[PDB]
Amino acid sequence: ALCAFKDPYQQDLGIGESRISHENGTILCSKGSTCYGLWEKSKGDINLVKQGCWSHIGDPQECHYEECVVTTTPPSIQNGTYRFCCCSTDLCNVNFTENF
């Protein structure tokens, strides 16, 4: 999938650089690779932390949510500040939807 991309530490070594548009904020993951997004929230300031490629076909924990949904499961159920989701379709990780 094509995924939303954010990683402030990527530019140093250039990991995945040929697949990233820094201008448009995307990363082309392989076909069969899913996306993730991670946000942190406080009062109620929602900050985007990272976005990018998550799991690939055959990996131990495949993601089969089409949309980026946050459930009452870790990390949120341990610390209410994180919002993590993974999702399988193109650009699905642009934003998150709480499903509590």
CATH number of 1-100: 2.10.60.10
Q: To which residue do tokens 């509590």 refer?
A: 100
Q: Where are the alpha helices (DSSP H) in the chain?
A: 10-13
**90, two tokens:** 């193109």
Q: Are 8 and 42 in contact (CB under 8 A)?
A: no
Cis peptide before 75 (omega within 30 of 0): yes
What resolution in Å is listed for this PDB structure?
A: 1.5
- φ, ψ dihedrals at 86, nearest 5°: -125, 155
- Of 83, 78, 97, which is closest to residue 51 (Cα–Cα)? 83
- φ, ψ dihedrals at 21, nearest 5°: -105, 110
Q: Indicate the domain borders of the chain.
A: 1-100
